[PDB]
Each structure stands twice: as C-alpha cells, then as structure tokens.
C-alpha cells in the first residue's frame, strides 16, 4: 500500500512535469527517424539485400554563387530583425 | 575626459591631430563626443589608418567604438589578418579561460570543442570573422559579440555554434561565476537563432529551407540543423518551420493534405496507385515510382514485413521445431540474414556512434543470440544442445518483440507517450531499491524466526527473496 | 486505453511465446496455443501469477502426453522422466513480466488518466454545455408526445 | 566620404523600397564613391530579395573625364579596380575634351529631367506628366547648382533633410545677411578656401532657391518615425 | 484543396458563389471576397456596414477555420 502508492504519485508528478515539454521532445526525436529514413537510397526492405550486392558492384569497380546569394538574402532579414528589436 | 579634451584640442598646434584626440576619447568612454566632433565634417577618413585604434578598441572592451568604426568604414576581413589573430589568441587571451578550455576538452569532449581546440592551438603558435567571434564569445564579452555577430554572413550558424560552445563551457565545475555568465550568454544566442530563423521562414519558405542545409564552407564543419541537434536545442526544431521541412521531407512526393488511410489503403492494394485517391503535388510509371520512393510508405511496408517476421518466428518456435530444420526455419534464417545485412550497413555508415544508441546495442545483442541459437541448434543427436538452442531462441524472441515499441514511436499519439515512458526509470529504480530493502529485512526475519539452519541455497533464496517478492502482488505469505 | 492495450499486447505476446516455447514441445492445437500464449499472460494483469513455471508445484495429472483430450501438454521430459526447463530461467522471467505489467504498465495508465482529467476539466464544463445543444434540439424539434404512444402519432 | 548614420540609412532603404513599390527610376552620380556605393548596395539587396515584380532601375550619369580605366569596344568590356560603381544597372557617361572638367554631366542630366517633366504619359494619377522628385542630403557646389537648375525649371519638387552640409543651411531658415549668418555657422571648414566674390554668387543662388518655397519641402527631426519619406514625397 | 479534402456545407456554398462570379445580399459577398484573401482590415470596415453582423462574424470564423487546415503554404494557414 505505502510503497506502491508512493510510486503512483511519483509517476503522476513526472507526467505532470514532462508533458508540456513532451511535445517538444517528441518532435525533437522525430528528426532522427526522418534522417535515418531519408539518408539511405532505400527500396522496400526484403529486396534491400539485392541492392547490397550492388554495393559490392561498387566494390567491383572501386565560392559558388547561389550559396553566396542565399547568404545575402539572409542578411536582409537580419537587418529587418535588428530593426524590430530596436523598435521594441 | 571632456576637460582633458578641451585642453588638448585648443593648443593651436594639435588642432589637426585627430589621432591623439581619438585615442584620448577612446581611452575614456566618450562615444558621443567622438561622434559629434571627430566623425562629422567628412573631411579626413583614410579608412586604412584606423587599424591601431581598432586593435585598441578590441583589446580594451570598447564595443561602441568598434561599432562606430565599422559604421564609418572599415572592412574586417581586410583588417583581420593572421598577425592580428595570433596576437589576440597569444597575448590578449586570458589564462583562466584557457584552463577552463583544457578542463572542458579533457572532461566534456565533443566535435565542436575539438574543432575550436584545434584552431585555438593553431593561433597560439579562411573565415576570419567567425574566428574573431569565437575569440570574443569564449572570453564572455557579451557585447563585442553582438557587434561582430551583426557583421557575419552565416548568421544563424554562428548563433547555433556559439550556443553550443557556451552550453559546453557552462559545465566546467570550477569558477562557477564564469559558468553562470556563459550559461546566460548561451541562452541569449539560442533565443537569437530561433527568432531570426522564424523571420526568415515567415518571409519565404524555399530559401529558408535552403538555409537549413548549408555548411558555411566549414564553419565548424557542420550544418545549421546538425548544430541545433548536437547542442540538444529542442526549441529550434519544435518550431513550425523546421517541422514543416521535416514533414515535407517525410511524405516525399505525396502531398501532405491527403488522409493517411488513403495512403495505407493504396499501400495494401498495390496497383491502385493509378487513381486519383493520392495527390502527388509536392506518366503512370512516374506515379508508381513516386509512390514507392517516399519514406512514409517504405517505412509502412517495412513494419508490415516485420510483423509477418514475428509471426513466422512464433510459428517456428512453438509449433514446428525438430531435429533437422524444416523449410520455414530456413526461411526464418534467411529473413534474419536480411536484418543482419541491414545492421552491418548501418554500422558501416555510422561507425562509432552506431554503438551510441541503445537500440543498436540491443539490436546487435539479439543478432548475436540468434547465431548462438544456431550453433547450439545444429548439434543434432544431442537432446541437451537442441533444447538449449530452443531456450536461446525464446529469449531472443523476447528481444525481437520488445523492439516493436521503438518501431512505433512515429505516431502523433503513440509517440509522445512512448517518450514519456522512458523518463520513468529513476522512479522505477527508487521503488526497486526501497522494495529490496524491505523485502530482504522481512525475508531474513521470517526465515530466521521460523526455521533453523537451512543449508541449501535455493531454499534460502526461495524463502528470503521470492515469497516476500510475491507479497507485492497481494499474496500474504503463508 | 489503446496505448495501454498496444504495450500490454506486446509484452503479453513476448512472454507468452517465450514460456510456451521453453516449457512444451510442438503443440498442434490452435486453441491450446492461444490459451497458453495470450490468455494466461492476459490474466496475469489482474494478479494471477502464471502457474506452471515452478517445477516443484507441477504435477503430471493435468497433462495429456499427446494431443488426445482437453488438458495441456506436459513439458518435454528428460531421459530420467524429469522436467527439462530450468527454474532459474523461468522464475525470473515470470518475475520480470509480472513487475512490468502488473505495476509499471498499469500505473503508467493511472498517470495518463490523471493528466488527461487535469487537461480537459476547465474545458469540460464548456464541452458539456456544448453537447447540451444536441439533446435540447432533438427533444424540442419533434412534436413529441409520451414515447409509448408516439407510434399512434 | 559619406557619414552613414542609421537614420539616413533607414531613409534611403525606405526610399529604394518606395522605388520598388512604385516602379521608379532613380538618377544618381554612379561612381563607386560615397553615397552611390550604398545606393548600389541597396539596389542589389532589393534585387536579390525578390528578383521579379518590376526590378528597379538605377541610372548613373558620369563625366568620362574622371574615370581611371577606360576601354573602347562596340563585344563586352571588363572594368576592374573616379571609379564607377558596379551595382548600377544602367550607366551613361557624357563626352567632353580633357580630364580637368567637372560638372559636365549636369547640363545633359538637367535637360533629361526637363524632358521627362514635359513628357506626357496619361497612364498614371498625376494627370499624366510622370512626376519627378529631386533629393538633396549632402553638400557641395553641384548640390546648389542642381537645386537651382531644378527650381528654375517647372516641377522641381525638391526635398531636403535637416542634417548634412547644405541640408542644414536650407532647412534652418524656412536677405543676404541671414544667408551669410547660417553659411558661416554651419560650414566652418569650407569657407576657409573660398573668396567672397562667389559667396555673393551663392547668396544669389539661394535667393533663386527661396524664390518659390512651395516647390521645396523638408524632412524634420520630430518627423522621424515610419513612412516619413512617403509623407515628404 | 479545401473543397476536395475538407468539404463542408458552407464551403460548398462559397464554392458555388465563387464559381458563379468567375463566369442578393451583396455586402456579404464582398465580405467573403475580402475575408478569403486574408485582408484583415478591409474586412472590419466592411463588417461594420453589414446588417447580419453576428451571422457574418460566425460564418467568417467558420470559413477561416476551414482554410487554416490546408497543409501547403502554412503562412496563409
Ligand atoms: O529495421 C529494423 N531492424 C531491426 C532488427 C534487426 C535485427 C535484430 C534486431 N533485434 O534483435 O533487436 C532488430 C529492428 C526492427 N527494424 C524496423 C523495421 C521496420 C520499421 C522500423 C524498424 O526499426
Ligand atoms: Ca538498428
């Protein structure tokens, strides 16, 4: 009775803590599965082993302007954001 | 300062000596006077003569004067050469800060810290503004940092990298005042990065998604999103722009405003891709490939395969298991070999951090117990080896079935609760400590009062630990 | 409720197939597969503590030796007519399962119910008096007489 | 040089924003020196932020006698490091004789202003006629000469600030005596290389300026909030 | 996209009238025009002129709560 219903209370309080953070923690963890399923050139899984042989096929044989352009884009809203800060 | 300036200016000889008046108004903090009657008439700005007074305004914490000098014309990358940076990191770099940096490199080591330790070990013996931003940001200067942050090109990468460095250096235990200042400055720059990127996303979506993926030609050798992750900056990813980027990269070619049951129903009925029930906005074989390429459906196909794998494992383990492997046992070995090739591919693409995650650790553990069950299982004409092989397969089935939890973290509703579940382990271990104390106390008390000189260890531990353990589920010892 | 049922189904299937595979050998009847894989670990949620894992309180009068009558099979025996299953691998397995479902997974559900009640209560008066509209409209729209007599109208 | 305080920075960024909003030409000196540098920077900024919807037009008008590196083709050239600014989308350079000739572009520039002010194009809200505004913010002889050339012409629409060199001396007063009084108290180190035989000429210049004060307007110091440039123009 | 995926009675009505006028209560029609475009300040000026004021506010609230569910262009949402 005493030692189990202490655990009930501690679970209830921990759920009360971590819930308003828990949406953030879920959609932070979402990054990892999206990155492990978008990084690989993935086919359906049973057939993936065939493409692993194609990896063996690889082992059978073996300053840019628009980046400066988008950084120059970013600087404009930097200036806009600084104006907004000083306007506060 | 104003009195000394009035006596220095009206001496009828040094009325033309603007350098002396500037150095005098720099050693004191007369910003407004130097703005009003040095930089007004536009009569003499050489714009390459301001180098020593710039170096002085840096090394003596004069943020408003360096703001004024850059406002009145001075290119940083023209100014900031290697001799300047070696003099700053050699001479004007504090020696308590370097001790905190050694302690952080020896105890809280990380990729970005190894990078900044390499460059700070370089310059004590090319992206220069970021190097001077690291200089000012390590020293906890807090106001020279913002002045030089506004001049930078990779602004949000600078804010995220500075947030990560300061969140590391806030963990060094000696000199907790410096820990407190670096923690406050870390919070300030991570707020700044979030607030600037929400403006950039609100004004345009496509170019902000261009910003999220760029590498600054080795800022720290990483990415804006990667530096947000590695500092555990979970407020930067919980904002709607990065979430929109993630979901657009997760559904792939399928537009997000189609309902999920249409997608999984077109998944089960395979040639139904040639109909207008899914929307491929974001001739007919292109619909086929653009359906079967997206991450959502290859994940859903993969969980259907894994459920069928668990049913085959259960059938083989319970109802069809003999001295020689039948055909379904060999099909089971083939599917586990497919999973093995997947895991060695993931180790090949990850390396050392592959063993970071718990799920890859228990994943390796389950594969090892499966091949142990194979090498116990093949010793035919020996009942003990065959039965021990089946026991090994049963415990391995426990592992393979418990992996399904971490598979299903992707739901909108199952997800947060599975995350909430793993925050409970400290309460569970607290309960187990206290219950073990009470259990051992009552068990030895009862076994000592009742009986006399048991000599068998099994009937010690069945009557000391086991029955007071069952008295937790309401058994009331007999 | 459905989150609890998903996690309890996962733990239940895992322990059920582990116990049925360690104890017995090649059951062929589907009813006595699903009574011993799903049903007894389901009853282990209301505090039943599954029985045939002890090897000392296990008598052979509830076996069949072959699938012939109602009762379950025996555990597969030794060459000295003794049970083959280790107590040191089935006793702590029952202990781990009984801990993880009867205490951890239920008191997680208690906490989630408590938090959901804590959410929806300051909205719950609004949701009740929003739902009140529907019953008032279904009882004021019809020209209603008493119900038994309604068929006459 | 150009004293770039953030107020005039905000004013000129707002100005080129208005020029993109209305689809206007801007005419300026077009050299790589001083203000035209920053104007070309903001032209490049608003060009690079949107890249469509009436991309703005800056014409620089230079004299060709002060240019360092001059190349003759018919076949594109490559000008590299007076110096031309790289960011003005159109450049025009007037022809003359030798190099020691400033203020040569001013006659053709003002004649072009007068021709657009008499150009009739009814597809607007100004009764046709394509409205023209002139701006003075800095200082020098060319400022006052251009302002008098404008205000003698019809529709100058001259706007000044209350900060700078000649902007202070026109903004403050609104005879010969007060012209001299403000000219000596607001420009201390420029009169020191000047005879009075042209200072009386400058008195005549400013008397022709203030002849029509309805064609002149000023941006003040209390007027310093948002959309003050639109309120002026 | 809202008519094909989040269909409703009021959306079918406004789809009928916006398909009418691309090929009588007029102020409410211009209020729908200004309210769809997210104009947010012409809407209040024309709302003050309307007769059925609270019906206009509730119908506009329903249309905008529907169009906030369209997934592409989340800024307009
Ligand atoms: O790819 C996968 N590999 C294994 C795996 C492979 C071999 C051994 C073990 N194991 O024993 O824990 C696990 C776990 C499940 N899994 C998976 C399937 C569909 C969706 C998500 C997933 O994570
Ligand atoms: Ca894995």
Swiss-Prot record, chain B:
**Where, in this chain's numbering, is Ca(2+) bound?**
343, 346, 360, 363
Q: Where in the body, by tissue, does this protein show up?
A: Expressed in dorsal root and trigeminal ganglia. Specifically expressed in a subset of pain- and temperature-sensing neurons. Not expressed in heavily myelinated neurons. Not expressed in neurons expressing TRPA1 or TRPV1.
What pairs make up the disulfide bonds?
none
Q: What phenotype has been reported when the gene encoding this protein is knocked out?
A: Trpm8-deficient mice have severe behavioral deficits in response to cold stimuli.
Residues on the membrane's Cytoplasmic side span 351-357, 410-414
- Impact of mutating residue 382 to Q? No effect on glycosylation or ability to form functional channels
- Describe PTMs of this protein: N-glycosylation is not essential for but facilitates cell surface expression, multimerization, association with lipid rafts and ion channel activity.
Q: Which residues cross the membrane?
A: 295-319, 327-350, 358-378, 384-409, 415-451
Q: Where is the protein found, in the record's own terms? A: Cell membrane; Membrane raft
Intramembrane residue segments, as ranges: 457-473
Superkingdom in the source lineage = Eukaryota
Per the record, what ranges lie on the membrane's Extracellular side? 320-326, 379-383, 452-456
The family line of this record is:
Belongs to the transient receptor (TC 1.A.4) family. LTrpC subfamily. TRPM8 sub-subfamily.
This protein's domain notes: Cooling agents bind within a pocket formed entirely by the S1-S4 helices that opens to the cytoplasm. The coiled coil region is required for multimerization.
Give the quaternary structure: Homotetramer. Interacts (via N-terminus and C-terminus domains) with TCAF1; the interaction stimulates TRPM8 channel activity. Interacts (via N-terminus and C-terminus domains) with TCAF2; the interaction inhibits TRPM8 channel activity.
Functionally, this protein is described as follows:
Non-selective ion channel permeable to monovalent and divalent cations, including Na(+), K(+), and Ca(2+), with higher permeability for Ca(2+). Activated by multiple factors, such as temperature, voltage, pressure, and changes in osmolality. Activated by cool temperatures (<23-28 degrees Celsius) and by chemical ligands evoking a sensation of coolness, such as menthol and icilin, therefore plays a central role in the detection of environmental cold temperatures.
What is the protein named? Answer: Transient receptor potential cation channel subfamily M member 8
Query: What organism does the UniProt record list as the source?
Result: Mus musculus (Mouse)
From Swiss-Prot, chain E:
Name where it's found. Answer: Cell membrane; Membrane raft
Modification after translation (UniProt): N-glycosylation is not essential for but facilitates cell surface expression, multimerization, association with lipid rafts and ion channel activity.
Superkingdom classification of source = Eukaryota
Please give the knockout or disruption phenotype noted for this protein: Trpm8-deficient mice have severe behavioral deficits in response to cold stimuli.
Please give the tissue specificity annotation from the record for this chain. Expressed in dorsal root and trigeminal ganglia. Specifically expressed in a subset of pain- and temperature-sensing neurons. Not expressed in heavily myelinated neurons. Not expressed in neurons expressing TRPA1 or TRPV1.
Entry comment, domain topic: Cooling agents bind within a pocket formed entirely by the S1-S4 helices that opens to the cytoplasm. The coiled coil region is required for multimerization.
Q: What does this protein do?
A: Non-selective ion channel permeable to monovalent and divalent cations, including Na(+), K(+), and Ca(2+), with higher permeability for Ca(2+). Activated by multiple factors, such as temperature, voltage, pressure, and changes in osmolality. Activated by cool temperatures (<23-28 degrees Celsius) and by chemical ligands evoking a sensation of coolness, such as menthol and icilin, therefore plays a central role in the detection of environmental cold temperatures.
Q: Which family does it belong to?
A: Belongs to the transient receptor (TC 1.A.4) family. LTrpC subfamily. TRPM8 sub-subfamily.
| Subunit-level organization | Homotetramer. Interacts (via N-terminus and C-terminus domains) with TCAF1; the interaction stimulates TRPM8 channel activity. Interacts (via N-terminus and C-terminus domains) with TCAF2; the interaction inhibits TRPM8 channel activity.
Protein's name in the database: Transient receptor potential cation channel subfamily M member 8
Q: Which organism is it from?
A: Mus musculus (Mouse)
Full protein: residues contained: 511 to 611 of 1104
